[PDB]
Amino acid sequence: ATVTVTDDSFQEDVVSSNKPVLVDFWATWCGPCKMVAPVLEEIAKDHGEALTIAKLDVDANPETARAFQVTSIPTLILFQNGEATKRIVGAKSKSALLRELDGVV
Amino acid sequence: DHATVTVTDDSFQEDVVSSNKPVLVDFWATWCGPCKMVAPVLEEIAKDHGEALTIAKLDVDANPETARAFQVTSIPTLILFQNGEATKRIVGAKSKSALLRELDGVV
Ligand code: NA
């Protein structure tokens, strides 16, 4: 359910997205990134009609990491109509992320 | 004694944990902008103080075992080691004056 976005695809996949997109800016070795990943997938499976969930590997896509000044990981950014509207830092439980996504799901 | 050094997952135990000099490790990444700001600051501190303090750089994505070991979730993170004990954790880019103040008593 989760989609992979890159520096090349970001504009089409996220900024030009008809529906809201939550982007997980993550890195490979980071504990909280490993933990939040399946939580996001379970959210994407449950709320797929309302919300797209995307992953952006910061090490592989440094242009987009830098554009949103990602300096803590994971950083989750909600995009609505081309604009970043929520920024959530750290692993979060399913319930905590659903709090942050209230009115979007 | 006058310049920064590189440390790795393979070299960390010998270079940092077993060092008799204090060591300041810069946990940095290619994808993180503020790391570019702090790098020359660290070099300037090494020039002035390298006989007393080793300044080491650890690229977190190349060295995932050490990055995870110190639970570095913000970049850059600078960790001071004294006798292998992590005694201070400094988060984010800092000015030369600011970093020198963080290193009070060390340099
Ligand atoms: Na890298």
XYZ file of N, CA, C and O and ligand atoms in Angstrom:
849
model
N 0.825 -1.251 0.000
C 0.000 0.000 0.000
C 0.839 1.272 0.000
O 0.499 2.222 -0.700
N 1.896 1.302 0.815
C 2.805 2.418 0.857
C 3.463 2.567 -0.525
O 3.721 1.558 -1.185
N 3.715 3.798 -0.975
C 4.421 4.002 -2.250
C 5.819 4.597 -2.039
O 6.022 5.306 -1.066
N 6.757 4.296 -2.942
C 8.137 4.816 -2.878
C 8.229 6.020 -3.780
O 7.848 5.930 -4.962
N 8.656 7.150 -3.226
C 8.867 8.373 -4.035
C 10.338 8.773 -3.994
O 11.060 8.409 -3.067
N 10.784 9.469 -5.033
C 12.190 9.826 -5.188
C 12.301 11.299 -5.528
O 11.289 11.937 -5.773
N 13.534 11.814 -5.566
C 13.787 13.170 -6.032
C 13.130 13.387 -7.417
O 12.505 14.425 -7.657
N 13.264 12.405 -8.309
C 12.708 12.520 -9.658
C 11.179 12.500 -9.722
O 10.597 13.189 -10.555
N 10.552 11.689 -8.876
C 9.107 11.483 -8.897
C 8.335 12.392 -7.939
O 7.091 12.420 -7.972
N 9.039 13.153 -7.102
C 8.375 13.864 -5.997
C 7.293 14.827 -6.457
O 6.205 14.885 -5.861
N 7.607 15.590 -7.502
C 6.694 16.596 -8.039
C 5.402 15.957 -8.589
O 4.296 16.424 -8.294
N 5.528 14.883 -9.365
C 4.341 14.173 -9.853
C 3.582 13.466 -8.733
O 2.347 13.592 -8.630
N 4.321 12.759 -7.874
C 3.717 11.827 -6.926
C 3.158 12.488 -5.681
O 2.238 11.958 -5.067
N 3.735 13.616 -5.275
C 3.381 14.244 -4.009
C 2.813 15.645 -4.244
O 1.641 15.904 -3.926
N 3.617 16.533 -4.819
C 3.203 17.936 -4.906
C 1.977 18.092 -5.818
O 1.094 18.897 -5.530
N 1.913 17.304 -6.886
C 0.777 17.335 -7.811
C -0.346 16.345 -7.469
O -1.250 16.153 -8.285
N -0.306 15.725 -6.286
C -1.282 14.693 -5.910
C -2.659 15.288 -5.684
O -2.806 16.256 -4.930
N -3.665 14.687 -6.317
C -5.055 15.038 -6.070
C -5.467 14.847 -4.598
O -6.149 15.695 -4.029
N -5.067 13.736 -3.988
C -5.429 13.461 -2.587
C -4.258 13.755 -1.606
O -3.130 13.938 -2.037
N -4.545 13.820 -0.291
C -3.482 14.067 0.691
C -2.419 12.990 0.639
O -2.745 11.811 0.403
N -1.173 13.392 0.865
C -0.050 12.442 0.907
C 0.764 12.645 2.174
O 1.224 13.740 2.431
N 0.909 11.585 2.958
C 1.806 11.593 4.102
C 3.130 10.967 3.653
O 3.169 9.805 3.228
N 4.202 11.756 3.720
C 5.532 11.277 3.303
C 6.396 10.991 4.519
O 6.581 11.881 5.352
N 6.894 9.746 4.609
C 7.855 9.300 5.628
C 9.255 9.507 5.100
O 9.678 8.818 4.188
N 9.959 10.517 5.642
C 11.366 10.761 5.330
C 12.164 9.940 6.341
O 12.106 10.186 7.573
N 12.842 8.919 5.834
C 13.451 7.891 6.669
C 14.869 7.505 6.245
O 15.317 7.838 5.140
N 15.581 6.831 7.136
C 16.901 6.231 6.832
C 16.981 4.799 7.320
O 16.320 4.408 8.313
N 17.857 4.022 6.669
C 17.880 2.548 6.833
C 18.137 1.942 8.244
O 17.420 1.010 8.707
N 19.134 2.453 8.910
C 19.636 1.902 10.199
C 18.877 2.408 11.449
O 19.098 1.934 12.571
N 17.990 3.391 11.263
C 17.402 4.132 12.380
C 16.245 3.340 12.988
O 15.263 3.034 12.304
N 16.403 2.966 14.254
C 15.416 2.184 14.982
C 13.980 2.662 14.839
O 13.080 1.882 14.484
N 13.731 3.951 15.136
C 12.379 4.395 15.045
C 11.854 4.325 13.636
O 10.638 4.188 13.452
N 12.716 4.407 12.626
C 12.228 4.269 11.245
C 11.747 2.829 10.992
O 10.710 2.610 10.316
N 12.517 1.864 11.506
C 12.145 0.444 11.363
C 10.817 0.155 12.025
O 10.018 -0.639 11.525
N 10.552 0.788 13.162
C 9.326 0.547 13.880
C 8.115 1.206 13.249
O 7.028 0.619 13.243
N 8.261 2.421 12.736
C 7.103 3.157 12.214
C 6.656 2.630 10.847
O 5.495 2.748 10.480
N 7.578 2.032 10.099
C 7.281 1.561 8.738
C 6.053 0.636 8.670
O 5.125 0.899 7.904
N 6.012 -0.437 9.486
C 4.792 -1.263 9.375
C 3.542 -0.604 9.896
O 2.432 -0.958 9.472
N 3.685 0.342 10.826
C 2.544 1.077 11.326
C 1.914 1.903 10.192
O 0.685 1.915 10.010
N 2.758 2.587 9.427
C 2.316 3.329 8.256
C 1.619 2.443 7.232
O 0.621 2.863 6.614
N 2.145 1.236 7.033
C 1.572 0.294 6.059
C 0.156 -0.077 6.512
O -0.778 -0.092 5.699
N -0.012 -0.358 7.801
C -1.329 -0.756 8.330
C -2.318 0.399 8.153
O -3.471 0.171 7.788
N -1.855 1.637 8.364
C -2.655 2.837 8.082
C -3.029 2.977 6.601
O -4.184 3.315 6.270
N -2.066 2.720 5.717
C -2.282 2.811 4.283
C -3.309 1.786 3.822
O -4.131 2.102 2.961
N -3.255 0.581 4.400
C -4.227 -0.488 4.114
C -5.634 -0.118 4.580
O -6.616 -0.464 3.926
N -5.738 0.550 5.725
C -7.038 0.894 6.292
C -7.672 2.151 5.713
O -8.902 2.253 5.685
N -6.856 3.113 5.292
C -7.352 4.433 4.900
C -6.923 4.826 3.494
O -6.856 6.002 3.154
N -6.686 3.816 2.658
C -6.123 4.010 1.319
C -6.924 4.915 0.403
O -6.350 5.656 -0.392
N -8.252 4.867 0.513
C -9.122 5.734 -0.294
C -8.942 7.232 0.020
O -9.086 8.073 -0.869
N -8.632 7.562 1.273
C -8.566 8.952 1.731
C -7.161 9.544 1.643
O -6.999 10.734 1.409
N -6.157 8.698 1.840
C -4.796 9.155 2.059
C -3.795 8.255 1.368
O -3.879 7.038 1.505
N -2.849 8.853 0.640
C -1.680 8.127 0.118
C -0.531 8.193 1.143
O -0.284 9.243 1.713
N 0.124 7.062 1.400
C 1.307 7.040 2.256
C 2.515 6.721 1.402
O 2.517 5.730 0.684
N 3.535 7.565 1.507
C 4.712 7.471 0.658
C 5.965 7.438 1.518
O 5.951 7.900 2.648
N 7.025 6.848 0.977
C 8.304 6.740 1.681
C 9.357 7.438 0.842
O 9.417 7.234 -0.372
N 10.218 8.226 1.497
C 11.330 8.905 0.817
C 12.610 8.595 1.614
O 12.766 9.035 2.761
N 13.479 7.801 1.000
C 14.758 7.409 1.552
C 15.684 8.637 1.470
O 16.143 8.984 0.385
N 15.979 9.262 2.610
C 16.721 10.536 2.546
C 18.141 10.400 1.967
O 18.612 11.294 1.260
N 18.820 9.292 2.274
C 20.202 9.086 1.793
C 20.219 8.968 0.260
O 21.175 9.419 -0.385
N 19.190 8.332 -0.306
C 19.105 8.154 -1.759
C 18.510 9.379 -2.472
O 18.606 9.482 -3.676
N 17.864 10.269 -1.730
C 17.152 11.392 -2.300
C 17.462 12.654 -1.506
O 16.568 13.246 -0.902
N 18.744 13.071 -1.518
C 19.133 14.200 -0.674
C 18.540 15.542 -1.111
O 18.390 16.423 -0.263
N 18.197 15.716 -2.394
C 17.613 16.997 -2.838
C 16.302 17.265 -2.117
O 16.051 18.369 -1.655
N 15.455 16.245 -2.025
C 14.147 16.415 -1.423
C 14.275 16.475 0.087
O 13.582 17.258 0.733
N 15.186 15.678 0.658
C 15.476 15.792 2.100
C 15.831 17.242 2.432
O 15.270 17.851 3.362
N 16.760 17.809 1.663
C 17.231 19.173 1.944
C 16.107 20.207 1.753
O 15.986 21.173 2.527
N 15.275 20.010 0.744
C 14.173 20.941 0.461
C 13.226 21.119 1.648
O 12.721 22.219 1.872
N 13.001 20.060 2.424
C 12.156 20.144 3.614
C 12.952 20.156 4.916
O 12.384 19.946 6.004
N 14.262 20.397 4.790
C 15.171 20.540 5.925
C 14.961 19.400 6.927
O 14.812 19.629 8.125
N 14.961 18.168 6.420
C 14.883 16.983 7.284
C 16.214 16.728 8.029
O 17.256 16.410 7.426
N 16.198 16.951 9.330
C 17.371 16.783 10.188
C 17.125 15.804 11.344
O 18.066 15.435 12.039
N 15.875 15.360 11.550
C 15.576 14.274 12.495
C 14.847 13.217 11.700
O 14.149 13.551 10.767
N 15.001 11.958 12.094
C 14.355 10.863 11.391
C 13.705 9.902 12.397
O 14.212 9.695 13.503
N 12.521 9.362 12.036
C 11.756 9.730 10.832
C 11.121 11.096 10.975
O 10.782 11.513 12.107
N 10.987 11.799 9.856
C 10.126 12.971 9.781
C 8.987 12.640 8.814
O 9.212 12.215 7.662
N 7.744 12.787 9.295
C 6.562 12.528 8.469
C 5.939 13.866 8.128
O 5.691 14.670 9.041
N 5.733 14.139 6.835
C 5.146 15.401 6.412
C 3.873 15.136 5.608
O 3.874 14.335 4.662
N 2.777 15.771 6.014
C 1.509 15.626 5.313
C 1.436 16.725 4.284
O 1.610 17.899 4.630
N 1.189 16.351 3.033
C 0.961 17.324 1.960
C -0.497 17.338 1.529
O -1.102 16.284 1.303
N -1.058 18.544 1.421
C -2.414 18.740 0.911
C -2.350 19.879 -0.107
O -1.950 20.989 0.232
N -2.715 19.572 -1.353
C -2.700 20.550 -2.452
C -1.336 21.229 -2.653
O -1.263 22.444 -2.855
N -0.260 20.458 -2.581
C 1.074 20.978 -2.855
C 1.792 21.588 -1.671
O 2.972 21.889 -1.766
N 1.101 21.737 -0.546
C 1.655 22.423 0.610
C 1.824 21.446 1.765
O 0.936 20.647 2.044
N 2.975 21.522 2.430
C 3.190 20.819 3.698
C 2.283 21.417 4.780
O 2.368 22.624 5.060
N 1.416 20.601 5.377
C 0.464 21.097 6.376
C 0.652 20.510 7.762
O 0.104 21.042 8.712
N 1.402 19.416 7.890
C 1.702 18.841 9.201
C 3.099 18.279 9.143
O 3.459 17.704 8.127
N 3.847 18.436 10.239
C 5.178 17.842 10.376
C 5.264 17.110 11.716
O 5.124 17.729 12.771
N 5.510 15.804 11.660
C 5.475 14.920 12.818
C 6.849 14.249 12.925
O 7.281 13.599 11.987
N 7.521 14.376 14.065
C 8.867 13.820 14.189
C 8.942 12.677 15.194
O 8.444 12.817 16.301
N 9.555 11.558 14.801
C 9.679 10.366 15.666
C 8.765 9.209 15.310
O 7.760 9.390 14.616
N 9.109 8.009 15.770
C 8.191 6.885 15.647
C 6.959 7.235 16.486
O 7.060 7.906 17.519
N 5.800 6.834 15.989
C 4.541 7.064 16.666
C 3.757 5.780 16.591
O 3.921 4.995 15.644
N 2.888 5.576 17.572
C 1.959 4.462 17.537
C 0.915 4.688 16.449
O 0.811 5.792 15.913
N 0.150 3.647 16.128
C -0.950 3.768 15.168
C -1.956 4.827 15.663
O -2.354 5.720 14.901
N -2.311 4.757 16.948
C -3.275 5.702 17.539
C -2.759 7.154 17.511
O -3.513 8.068 17.162
N -1.479 7.347 17.840
C -0.834 8.676 17.784
C -0.793 9.291 16.381
O -0.984 10.508 16.217
N -0.556 8.456 15.367
C -0.551 8.946 13.994
C -1.978 9.245 13.571
O -2.225 10.224 12.867
N -2.927 8.411 13.996
C -4.323 8.680 13.670
C -4.788 9.995 14.306
O -5.607 10.706 13.733
N -4.264 10.313 15.481
C -4.523 11.615 16.089
C -4.077 12.708 15.137
O -4.840 13.613 14.828
N -2.836 12.599 14.671
C -2.246 13.609 13.787
C -2.975 13.735 12.448
O -2.987 14.807 11.852
N -3.575 12.639 11.989
C -4.314 12.596 10.727
C -5.821 12.827 10.873
O -6.593 12.576 9.930
N -6.265 13.326 12.027
C -7.689 13.546 12.239
C -8.232 14.483 11.166
O -7.630 15.513 10.871
N -9.361 14.117 10.582
C -9.968 14.944 9.547
C -9.398 14.686 8.161
O -9.990 15.098 7.164
N -8.256 14.008 8.080
C -7.724 13.592 6.791
C -8.165 12.169 6.430
O -8.439 11.902 5.259
N -8.242 11.266 7.413
C -8.713 9.886 7.159
C -10.240 9.797 7.181
O -10.840 8.730 7.043
N 46.649 15.443 15.364
C 46.901 16.570 16.303
C 46.539 17.939 15.748
O 46.589 18.902 16.511
N 46.258 18.061 14.443
C 45.822 19.352 13.879
C 44.662 19.250 12.899
O 44.339 20.243 12.260
N 44.033 18.067 12.761
C 43.015 17.865 11.735
C 42.030 16.821 12.189
O 42.338 15.977 13.050
N 40.834 16.885 11.623
C 39.852 15.828 11.885
C 40.287 14.479 11.306
O 41.109 14.399 10.351
N 39.725 13.421 11.883
C 39.950 12.037 11.432
C 38.634 11.350 11.069
O 37.564 11.791 11.493
N 38.719 10.248 10.319
C 37.505 9.464 9.961
C 37.465 8.244 10.856
O 38.461 7.572 11.004
N 36.288 7.916 11.368
C 36.096 6.654 12.090
C 34.951 5.895 11.459
O 34.083 6.483 10.805
N 34.951 4.589 11.667
C 34.033 3.679 11.026
C 33.514 2.636 12.006
O 34.057 2.494 13.084
N 32.510 1.863 11.585
C 32.054 0.718 12.389
C 33.238 -0.180 12.755
O 33.366 -0.578 13.920
N 34.119 -0.460 11.795
C 35.268 -1.344 12.021
C 36.308 -0.739 12.971
O 36.955 -1.466 13.727
N 36.491 0.586 12.920
C 37.561 1.242 13.677
C 37.124 1.870 15.023
O 37.956 2.334 15.796
N 35.824 1.890 15.291
C 35.279 2.711 16.396
C 35.793 2.308 17.768
O 36.146 3.175 18.606
N 35.873 1.004 18.026
C 36.300 0.515 19.345
C 37.725 0.969 19.630
O 38.037 1.422 20.693
N 38.597 0.844 18.637
C 40.002 1.185 18.819
C 40.231 2.714 18.819
O 40.936 3.269 19.687
N 39.626 3.384 17.850
C 39.857 4.806 17.624
C 39.174 5.710 18.641
O 39.707 6.779 18.993
N 37.960 5.352 19.037
C 37.166 6.230 19.934
C 37.065 5.667 21.336
O 37.503 6.319 22.317
N 36.536 4.455 21.460
C 36.232 3.906 22.811
C 37.528 3.717 23.619
O 37.597 4.053 24.818
N 38.569 3.250 22.941
C 39.877 2.974 23.582
C 40.871 4.130 23.561
O 41.983 4.023 24.116
N 40.493 5.251 22.955
C 41.345 6.441 22.976
C 41.659 6.936 24.383
O 40.780 7.021 25.232
N 42.902 7.328 24.623
C 43.200 8.032 25.892
C 42.945 9.539 25.828
O 42.575 10.143 26.837
N 43.043 10.133 24.643
C 42.585 11.513 24.470
C 41.057 11.510 24.476
O 40.437 10.548 23.988
N 40.434 12.581 24.967
C 38.990 12.698 24.677
C 38.766 12.752 23.167
O 39.629 13.246 22.420
N 37.606 12.290 22.721
C 37.264 12.280 21.291
C 35.875 12.872 21.142
O 34.952 12.441 21.816
N 35.724 13.827 20.247
C 34.419 14.364 19.862
C 34.059 13.748 18.518
O 34.757 13.963 17.544
N 32.987 12.959 18.497
C 32.536 12.305 17.281
C 31.349 13.072 16.693
O 30.296 13.207 17.335
N 31.510 13.421 15.422
C 30.477 14.077 14.604
C 29.750 13.028 13.796
O 30.317 12.473 12.856
N 28.525 12.732 14.226
C 27.650 11.817 13.510
C 26.958 12.642 12.453
O 26.107 13.491 12.770
N 27.340 12.443 11.193
C 26.885 13.297 10.112
C 26.371 12.483 8.944
O 26.526 11.255 8.894
N 25.738 13.175 8.006
C 25.226 12.541 6.795
C 25.297 13.440 5.586
O 25.188 14.655 5.702
N 25.476 12.811 4.430
C 25.496 13.481 3.165
C 24.176 14.211 2.882
O 24.190 15.216 2.191
N 23.062 13.747 3.457
C 21.715 14.246 3.094
C 21.258 15.389 4.008
O 20.151 15.931 3.858
N 22.140 15.796 4.926
C 21.784 16.744 5.982
C 22.590 18.038 5.859
O 23.788 18.078 6.181
N 21.914 19.118 5.458
C 22.510 20.462 5.253
C 23.362 21.088 6.361
O 24.497 21.532 6.115
N 22.850 21.128 7.603
C 23.610 21.665 8.716
C 24.970 20.971 8.965
O 25.874 21.583 9.563
N 25.122 19.724 8.516
C 26.437 19.062 8.624
C 27.493 19.826 7.846
O 28.670 19.876 8.275
N 27.105 20.400 6.703
C 28.051 21.203 5.906
C 28.515 22.466 6.641
O 29.667 22.901 6.486
N 27.647 23.031 7.467
C 27.999 24.194 8.265
C 28.939 23.834 9.404
O 29.922 24.534 9.660
N 28.721 22.693 10.057
C 29.526 22.378 11.243
C 30.899 21.798 10.871
O 31.842 21.951 11.619
N 31.044 21.217 9.691
C 32.313 20.580 9.289
C 33.529 21.539 9.380
O 34.534 21.187 10.038
N 33.444 22.749 8.779
C 34.625 23.619 8.909
C 34.842 24.147 10.322
O 35.968 24.467 10.686
N 33.767 24.265 11.111
C 33.913 24.654 12.496
C 34.783 23.631 13.243
O 35.704 23.982 13.973
N 34.461 22.367 13.062
C 35.217 21.278 13.650
C 36.662 21.289 13.200
O 37.565 21.041 14.005
N 36.891 21.562 11.926
C 38.264 21.615 11.424
C 39.054 22.704 12.149
O 40.230 22.527 12.459
N 38.419 23.860 12.375
C 39.080 24.987 13.021
C 39.385 24.685 14.478
O 40.471 25.015 14.965
N 38.476 23.984 15.162
C 38.752 23.512 16.505
C 39.913 22.485 16.517
O 40.800 22.538 17.385
N 39.976 21.608 15.521
C 41.085 20.643 15.458
C 42.426 21.343 15.274
O 43.438 20.932 15.853
N 42.436 22.395 14.465
C 43.661 23.173 14.248
C 44.202 23.775 15.538
O 45.429 23.743 15.785
N 43.296 24.303 16.357
C 43.636 24.992 17.577
C 43.898 24.068 18.754
O 44.648 24.442 19.671
N 43.241 22.902 18.781
C 43.171 22.081 19.986
C 43.426 20.583 19.799
O 43.249 19.784 20.737
N 43.829 20.187 18.595
C 43.957 18.782 18.249
C 44.944 17.972 19.104
O 44.795 16.767 19.217
N 45.943 18.602 19.706
C 46.818 17.855 20.610
C 46.118 17.427 21.892
O 46.624 16.529 22.571
N 45.006 18.077 22.249
C 44.251 17.749 23.466
C 42.986 16.946 23.195
O 42.559 16.180 24.041
N 42.393 17.151 22.024
C 41.087 16.589 21.682
C 41.108 16.050 20.256
O 41.427 16.772 19.327
N 40.766 14.783 20.071
C 40.583 14.243 18.736
C 39.170 14.558 18.254
O 38.212 14.379 18.999
N 39.060 15.040 17.023
C 37.773 15.247 16.398
C 37.618 14.259 15.225
O 38.403 14.283 14.230
N 36.614 13.386 15.381
C 36.367 12.264 14.498
C 35.012 12.421 13.813
O 34.085 13.027 14.358
N 34.937 11.954 12.571
C 33.685 12.027 11.793
C 33.195 10.628 11.471
O 33.972 9.783 11.014
N 31.903 10.398 11.722
C 31.276 9.084 11.489
C 30.085 9.321 10.563
O 29.091 9.940 10.951
N 30.202 8.843 9.325
C 29.122 8.967 8.332
C 28.052 7.910 8.687
O 28.333 6.738 8.595
N 26.874 8.331 9.165
C 25.908 7.393 9.768
C 25.407 6.361 8.763
O 25.186 5.195 9.112
N 25.261 6.749 7.509
C 24.695 5.808 6.536
C 25.674 4.754 6.095
O 25.243 3.616 5.818
N 26.970 5.096 6.109
C 28.054 4.132 5.881
C 28.407 3.257 7.075
O 29.081 2.233 6.932
N 27.959 3.676 8.253
C 28.337 3.084 9.540
C 27.111 2.913 10.406
O 26.980 3.523 11.487
N 26.182 2.091 9.913
C 24.905 1.952 10.567
C 24.983 1.304 11.955
O 24.121 1.576 12.769
N 25.976 0.463 12.229
C 26.052 -0.195 13.540
C 26.345 0.846 14.640
O 25.703 0.850 15.688
N 27.287 1.758 14.378
C 27.635 2.777 15.388
C 26.505 3.827 15.517
O 26.183 4.285 16.616
N 25.908 4.211 14.396
C 24.807 5.155 14.397
C 23.661 4.650 15.279
O 23.150 5.369 16.122
N 23.278 3.395 15.069
C 22.221 2.776 15.858
C 22.666 2.645 17.324
O 21.876 2.879 18.240
N 23.914 2.237 17.536
C 24.414 2.065 18.910
C 24.266 3.299 19.784
O 23.925 3.196 20.973
N 24.435 4.472 19.193
C 24.273 5.731 19.925
C 22.940 6.411 19.683
O 22.718 7.548 20.123
N 22.021 5.660 19.078
C 20.640 6.096 18.891
C 20.595 7.528 18.365
O 19.910 8.412 18.901
N 21.302 7.752 17.263
C 21.360 9.094 16.703
C 20.151 9.226 15.787
O 19.990 8.499 14.800
N 19.207 10.050 16.205
C 18.018 10.240 15.433
C 17.934 11.652 14.927
O 17.007 11.966 14.200
N 18.864 12.527 15.334
C 18.961 13.877 14.780
C 20.398 14.059 14.274
O 21.332 13.565 14.915
N 20.556 14.795 13.179
C 21.866 14.951 12.529
C 22.092 16.443 12.270
O 21.159 17.148 11.912
N 23.319 16.949 12.505
C 24.400 16.238 13.158
C 24.153 16.056 14.668
O 23.470 16.880 15.295
N 24.724 14.992 15.237
C 24.879 14.860 16.680
C 26.368 14.724 16.959
O 27.028 13.883 16.349
N 26.875 15.518 17.893
C 28.255 15.437 18.325
C 28.287 14.823 19.716
O 27.597 15.301 20.624
N 29.038 13.742 19.866
C 29.136 13.056 21.167
C 30.585 13.104 21.634
O 31.493 12.685 20.898
N 30.772 13.568 22.874
C 32.059 13.554 23.523
C 32.256 12.250 24.271
O 31.385 11.831 25.080
N 33.405 11.613 24.017
C 33.806 10.400 24.705
C 35.015 10.680 25.577
O 35.984 11.276 25.121
N 34.916 10.291 26.844
C 36.065 10.359 27.761
C 36.234 8.980 28.388
O 35.336 8.495 29.101
N 37.375 8.348 28.103
C 37.593 6.949 28.487
C 36.478 6.043 27.945
O 36.010 5.127 28.615
N 35.996 6.357 26.747
C 34.983 5.559 26.094
C 33.565 5.778 26.585
O 32.633 5.166 26.050
N 33.395 6.592 27.625
C 32.074 6.917 28.142
C 31.549 8.125 27.321
O 32.248 9.127 27.211
N 30.322 8.032 26.808
C 29.679 9.165 26.134
C 29.188 10.117 27.231
O 28.202 9.838 27.931
N 29.883 11.234 27.410
C 29.609 12.145 28.518
C 28.849 13.421 28.127
O 28.420 14.167 29.006
N 28.739 13.705 26.835
C 27.958 14.848 26.362
C 27.424 14.585 24.970
O 28.133 14.010 24.157
N 26.193 15.026 24.704
C 25.592 14.910 23.396
C 25.108 16.297 22.993
O 24.288 16.915 23.699
N 25.639 16.792 21.879
C 25.340 18.122 21.369
C 24.573 17.939 20.058
O 25.107 17.310 19.127
N 23.365 18.500 19.956
C 22.542 18.325 18.762
C 22.509 19.588 17.882
O 22.233 20.692 18.363
N 22.794 19.406 16.593
C 22.702 20.472 15.593
C 23.995 21.203 15.334
O 24.974 21.088 16.082
N 24.019 21.953 14.254
C 25.168 22.794 13.963
C 25.303 23.900 15.005
O 24.311 24.474 15.451
N 26.545 24.197 15.372
C 26.865 25.201 16.380
C 27.970 26.072 15.830
O 28.817 25.574 15.084
N 28.033 27.320 16.276
C 29.157 28.184 15.963
C 30.419 27.701 16.664
O 30.340 26.948 17.640
N 31.570 28.177 16.216
C 32.832 27.851 16.886
C 32.796 28.274 18.366
O 33.172 27.507 19.214
N 32.329 29.490 18.673
C 32.238 29.944 20.071
C 31.331 29.060 20.910
O 31.671 28.687 22.040
N 30.171 28.731 20.357
C 29.202 27.900 21.041
C 29.766 26.505 21.338
O 29.553 25.944 22.420
N 30.423 25.921 20.350
C 30.962 24.580 20.524
C 32.095 24.616 21.554
O 32.200 23.742 22.421
N 32.937 25.637 21.488
C 34.005 25.755 22.488
C 33.429 25.822 23.904
O 33.966 25.236 24.853
N 32.331 26.543 24.066
C 31.673 26.583 25.377
C 31.139 25.209 25.794
O 31.210 24.819 26.973
N 30.601 24.447 24.842
C 30.143 23.090 25.167
C 31.291 22.220 25.620
O 31.102 21.294 26.386
N 32.487 22.517 25.126
C 33.686 21.749 25.427
C 34.514 22.326 26.584
O 35.684 21.972 26.748
N 33.887 23.141 27.416
C 34.499 23.702 28.606
C 35.133 22.601 29.440
O 34.535 21.531 29.665
N 36.381 22.838 29.833
C 37.167 21.891 30.595
C 37.855 20.844 29.751
O 38.811 20.233 30.190
N 37.424 20.669 28.516
C 38.057 19.703 27.612
C 39.114 20.368 26.748
O 40.221 19.848 26.573
N 38.751 21.510 26.173
C 39.697 22.381 25.493
C 39.471 23.822 25.900
O 40.342 24.643 25.619
Na 25.359 9.020 2.316
